[PDB]
Design a protein around this nucleic acid. Structure first.
Ligand SMILES: [K+]
Ligand SMILES: [K+]
Ligand SMILES: [Mg+2]
Ligand SMILES: [Mg+2]
Ligand SMILES: [Mg+2]
Ligand SMILES: [Mg+2]
Ligand SMILES: [Mg+2]
Ligand SMILES: [Mg+2]
Ligand SMILES: [Mg+2]
Ligand SMILES: [Mg+2]
Ligand SMILES: [Mg+2]
Ligand SMILES: [Mg+2]
Ligand SMILES: [Mg+2]
Ligand SMILES: [Mg+2]
Ligand SMILES: [Mg+2]
Ligand SMILES: [Mg+2]
Ligand SMILES: [Mg+2]
Ligand SMILES: [Mg+2]
Ligand SMILES: [Mg+2]
Ligand SMILES: [Mg+2]
Ligand SMILES: [Mg+2]
Ligand SMILES: [Mg+2]
Ligand SMILES: [Mg+2]
Ligand SMILES: [Mg+2]
Ligand SMILES: [Mg+2]
Ligand SMILES: [Mg+2]
Ligand SMILES: [Mg+2]
Ligand SMILES: [Mg+2]
Ligand SMILES: [Mg+2]
Ligand SMILES: [Mg+2]
Ligand SMILES: [Zn+2]
Lengths: 98, 307, 46, 183, 201
RNA sequence: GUAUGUCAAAAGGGAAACAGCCCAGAACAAGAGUUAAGGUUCCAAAAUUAUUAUUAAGUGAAAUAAAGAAAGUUUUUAUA
RNA sequence: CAGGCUAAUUUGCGCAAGAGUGUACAAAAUGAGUGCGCGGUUUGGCACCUCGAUGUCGGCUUGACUAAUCCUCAUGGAUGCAGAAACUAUGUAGGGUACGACUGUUCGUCGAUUAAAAAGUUACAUGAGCUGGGUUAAAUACGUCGUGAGACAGUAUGGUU
RNA sequence: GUGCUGAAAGCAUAUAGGCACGAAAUUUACCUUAAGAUAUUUCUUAAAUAUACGUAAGAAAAUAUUACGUUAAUAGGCUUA
């Protein structure tokens, strides 16, 4: 190609700090909504699905926070900053073994 | 930068503060390093100013015809010595001919006044290797300053040729004559490429312009004849310039200096022909102060009409 | 000498050394062999 | 507005600072322990500090348009500190717009032709704003190779003790105690 | 290292004089590493070297021994100079007492050698010049360095002598550089028993 | 073709410069105001800010050239 | 047409591996079918883009740069380096690489010299510098195709640069 | 490309450390233009100096450059060779 989209393949230590803090901020929203309902003895299907199949920032591996699964990459991994609107989208789980 | 790798302001003088005696490495540049990498080439002795008088052949006994140029020495004196502690290099200033006092300016009249030398026509410096090349001021150099068979270099200004073309100036071939050519016979043709070459004419491009009237040096020219009465020094080959032009003659840099005996005999002949070159110089310097002090006070008229 | 991208020992006397490394360059990997001078190899191009 | 009303004569004056490229600098060195391992300020870290002084960005009255910079005398530039192998592997390039007239020279060879002061000026030059004050500011960087320089009388003093000398700090504090004895 | 631990037996007559940590001021460097001037005097001469400061010498004058040791075996720079500094002291001790020798053999029809004086190119008064007739068109003459004694017991046998091994062996390599041994006939200059394997034919 | 967005018709900040990417939707001013993306040695606003390791190649530092080679070096697992 | 993207292909190359040849012996030399690559010269693909073109190029004038080297300089390997010559490879682009005949042209082919008569990029590098060998016509003849007007990457002569 | 000393690694090693040989390339040297610090026991108090004009030229498209102007051989004429 000729149109230059200068996107580095890896993130900087400053972007990683904000990715860590963005994952840790979505945990407080799900922990606030999950505890607010438990006091009322209530539950939601989407709040129970999240806690089941999604990990917290303290349970994620570094490669799951800064990378995603791309079948067209050599090692099936791609920088998470390559995902559209990656800053306002949730992406924590990748296919097993990849 | 402006010239080279240096960003130092031109008005700053830091040389004396970076001394090798303080433990600093001897710089690779500077007057000291320039003289050290020219020690072998630099001529041991001074040169002479000569006037090109014409070309001829030196016919030798048994059959030798050697084309040669005649250079005449016309009252060649030593005017000033340039030392390393005062100027930064070793050299001797030589004068040639004479000039009318009216045409010589006051700045230069007081310059010769402090030496005892009549005003000269031209002046030129000849670099010497060390302090042994400096001669007494006011001594005349005769053709015997050289010896027959001594190779020398002659530096002279080449003949002027005005605005030259591409053929005469750079040896361009030109273009065709009759096979359809259109107004482009002696023209230079292409001046460059196209957008892939910078869309500009490249610095250093050869083009028409002025040719000649510049200094040219002919090296390794033997000395075939030395005639004191005539005052001429006949050298082999051609020399740059017209007849009647002044040229600079000195030992060849690419050849070994003359034997130690010769460099000493020539220096020993100046002490005989001019037994008192310092007494006549100190007397002229002593007089310059009196006249320079009379000019300052304004009483110069008194001294002029003293006798 | 043979400039390969993959230098290997071809006998028990072949030694792997890095020569010509100085304050101005990194040098090359060499296979030096006193028994057979045909095993002389270098890794890298000047 | 009152904070600026007064005599700003001494805020715009040019101060002659001094730093030695050989003296260990605890603040500008990356090795902070042990005491004997503290190194001097590297070329680029000494140049970034000098560029700040040349711009006057250390004063509370700094303005990019006003030329409120100061002087900086750098001595012992022959012992300029560098890391790795820059001295023999770093190249300085130069071109005069003529194809083929590219000039290359290494730091060690440029330190032989023009000394270590030239290598310092080339670093401080690229750290200044690229504008019409660049050559004025860079000219106030007086770099020398040894311990000698003509500005041994211009260096700022406090009670007779040059700043950076052994006991200058005690001379500065002895003058501020005499100042407080007034209304 | 396993060589730096071995004590250095000082034979009778050899005297070791250890200096004090000093630093020669270098305007080009901001910090020079201290060194120690070691003098090893004896019957034949005196040699000196400057060792890093981290190397510690246990000079036992009672038993006439000296063992080396470094301040940190974990540093690569200290492990290296430990074995090297020991290898030099071993040569200095065995070079000032007995001396170092190098024997060169000239193989080839027409190869000779003579020790004559060339006063024209003398670098120091009385310099000896080894003249080699190695089938060249020009003569090969090389002045012996100051401190070495060269003699030729036979026309095809040179004998270099000196207290500094690096100086003796480095001068023998200059002579051998004119005619390096060939593998077809064995012609050349062999230094200290050096041999070359020949071909079948 | 399909799904989603932007540009088109969207200025401003970041991506060295940049229709389409990352942020964010410009009515006008003021403020060391609070933040996004992104950054904080100098150019150039803000850390030469703390902790633990690796690298010695200026590798790298905002656009990953591959298989492969090798007493480069560190760690781990075994091991004499 | 040139520039732009791509690199199938190439008269562009490198590296890895080693069936095999080398009387012997893989790696002196040689290297099947392959793999991993660089690069942008040939023939192509695409179509962001209307412009000096269908041999896209030749000659002349004048260059500048590259290095994958024909000559000159230093050098490792070569049971297959005795010497000489030659082979292979590593450094190195300072200066050179001419002249003529026949071929529309470069493709090419040959003659006789020469230390050698090597290549490529630069919009055929260069026509507001030249040429017109070309880049296009209308005239005419012949050949082939078409019922015909006409057509042809045909052939020959001529044709405001 | 070829060495000396020599360890890490008892050996080996032109590997670290300490020395060295080595090319039509690079640098210097050589030549030219440019640069204009500096030098002179240099000149100047309204000048030194330069210019203009006139005769020219070692210079030449203009300009510039280098001489000369009567105490003068700058150009022309004349005279001799
Ligand atoms: K004509
Ligand atoms: K080698
Ligand atoms: Mg592009
Ligand atoms: Mg003329
Ligand atoms: Mg002609
Ligand atoms: Mg341009
Ligand atoms: Mg232009
Ligand atoms: Mg700027
Ligand atoms: Mg529209
Ligand atoms: Mg926008
Ligand atoms: Mg930036
Ligand atoms: Mg604030
Ligand atoms: Mg700032
Ligand atoms: Mg880099
Ligand atoms: Mg077989
Ligand atoms: Mg070759
Ligand atoms: Mg061989
Ligand atoms: Mg041979
Ligand atoms: Mg050259
Ligand atoms: Mg052409
Ligand atoms: Mg054109
Ligand atoms: Mg017709
Ligand atoms: Mg017909
Ligand atoms: Mg006609
Ligand atoms: Mg050893
Ligand atoms: Mg050895
Ligand atoms: Mg004066
Ligand atoms: Mg006047
Ligand atoms: Mg005129
Ligand atoms: Mg007349
Ligand atoms: Zn082997």
């Amino acid at each position: 190609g000729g149109l230059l989209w200068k996107i580095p393949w890896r993130m900087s230590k400053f972007q990683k700090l904000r990715q860590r803090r963005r994952l840790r901020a979505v945990d407080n929203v799900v922990a606030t909504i999950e505890n607010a309902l438990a006091k009322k003895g209530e539950t939601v299907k989407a709040v129970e699905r999240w806690r089941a199949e999604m990990p917290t920032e303290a349970e994620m591996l570094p490669k799951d926070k800064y990378t995603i699964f791309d079948r067209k990459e050599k090692r099936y991994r791609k920088g998470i900053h390559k995902l559209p609107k990656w800053t306002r989208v949730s992406q924590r789980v990748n296919p097993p073994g990849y | 930068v402006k010239y080279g790798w240096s960003t130092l302001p031109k008005r700053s003088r830091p040389t004396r503060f970076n001394q090798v005696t303080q433990g600093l490495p001897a710089p690779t540049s500077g007057p000291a390093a320039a003289l050290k990498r020219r020690e072998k080439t630099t001529p041991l002795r001074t040169g002479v100013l000569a006037v090109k008088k014409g070309m001829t052949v030196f016919m030798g006994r048994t059959g030798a015809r050697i084309p040669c140029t005649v250079l005449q020495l016309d009252r060649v004196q030593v005017v000033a010595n340039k030392t390393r502690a005062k100027n930064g290099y070793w050299a001797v200033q030589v004068g040639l001919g004479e000039r009318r006092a009216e045409n010589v300016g006051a700045p230069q009249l007081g310059y010769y006044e402090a030496k005892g030398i009549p005003p000269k026509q031209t002046l030129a410096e000849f670099k010497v290797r060390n302090q042994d090349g400096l001669l007494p001021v006011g001594v005349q150099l005769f053709p015997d300053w050289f010896h027959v068979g001594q190779v020398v270099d002659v530096r002279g200004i080449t003949r002027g040729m005005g605005f030259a073309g591409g053929m005469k100036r750079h040896g361009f071939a030109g273009q065709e004559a009759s096979h359809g050519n259109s107004l482009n016979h002696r023209t230079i043709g292409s001046v460059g490429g196209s957008q892939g070459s910078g869309s500009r004419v490249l610095p250093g491009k050869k083009m028409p312009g002025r040719m000649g009237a510049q200094q040219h040096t002919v090296q390794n020219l033997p000395i075939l004849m030395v005639d004191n009465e005539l005052g001429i020094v006949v050298v082999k080959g051609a020399v740059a310039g017209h007849k009647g032009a002044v040229v600079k003659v000195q030992d060849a840099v690419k050849k070994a200096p003359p034997p130690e005996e010769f460099v000493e005999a020539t220096k020993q002949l100046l002490n005989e022909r001019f037994p008192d070159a310092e007494e006549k110089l100190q007397a002229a310097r002593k007089l310059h102060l009196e006249l320079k002090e009379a000019r300052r006070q304004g009483l110069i008229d008194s001294l002029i009409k003293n006798g | 000498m043979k400039v390969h991208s993959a230098i290997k020992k071809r006998c028990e006397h072949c030694k792997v050394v890095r020569r010509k490394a100085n304050k101005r360059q990194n040098g090359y990997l060499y296979i030096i062999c006193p028994a057979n001078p045909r095993h002389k190899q270098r890794q890298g191009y000047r | 507005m009152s904070q600026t009303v007064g005599a700003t004569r001494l805020a715009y004056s040019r101060v002659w600072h001094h730093i030695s490229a050989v003296t260990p600098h605890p603040t500008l060195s990356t090795i902070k322990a042990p005491s004997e391992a503290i190194t001097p300020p590297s070329l680029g870290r000494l140049a970034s500090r000098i560029a700040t002084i040349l711009m006057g960005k250390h004063k509370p009255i700094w303005d990019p348009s006003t030329d409120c910079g100061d002087y900086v005398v750098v001595t012992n530039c022959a012992g300029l500190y560098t890391t790795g192998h820059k001295k023999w592997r770093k190249t300085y390039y130069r071109h005069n717009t003529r194809p083929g007239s590219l000039q290359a020279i290494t730091m060690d060879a440029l330190m032989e032709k023009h000394g270590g002061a030239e290598v310092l000026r080339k670093a401080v030059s690229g750290m200044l704003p690229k504008n019409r004050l660049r050559d004025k500011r860079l000219a106030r960087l007086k770099a020398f190779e040894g311990d000698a320089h003509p500005y041994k009388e211009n260096l700022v003093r406090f009670g007779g003790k040059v700043v950076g000398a052994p006991g200058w700090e005690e001379a500065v504090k002895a003058i501020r105690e005499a100042d407080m004895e007034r209304l | 290292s396993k060589l730096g631990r071995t004590p250095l037996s000082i034979p009778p007559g050899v005297e070791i004089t250890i200096g004090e940590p000093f630093v020669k001021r270098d305007m080009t460097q901001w910090k020079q590493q201290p060194k120690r001037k070691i003098t090893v005097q004896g019957p034949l001469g005196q040699l000196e070297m400057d060792i890093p400061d981290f190397i510690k010498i246990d000079h036992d004058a009672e038993a006439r021994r000296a063992t080396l040791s470094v301040a940190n075996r974990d540093e690569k720079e200290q492990r290296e100079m430990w074995g090297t500094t020991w290898a030099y002291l071993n040569r200095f001790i065995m070079g000032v007492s007995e001396g170092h020798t190098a024997v060169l053999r000239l193989v080839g029809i027409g190869y000779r050698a003579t020790i004559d004086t060339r006063p024209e190119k003398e670098e120091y008064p009385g310099q000896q010049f080894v003249c080699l007739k190695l089938g060249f068109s020009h003569p090969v003459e090389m002045g012996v360095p100051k401190g070495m004694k060269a003699s030729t017991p036979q026309p095809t046998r040179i004998l270099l002598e000196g207290i500094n091994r690096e100086q003796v062996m480095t001068f023998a390599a200059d002579i051998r550089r004119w005619r390096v041994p060939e593998p077809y006939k064995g012609k050349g200059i062999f230094v200290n028993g050096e041999t070359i394997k020949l071909k079948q034919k």
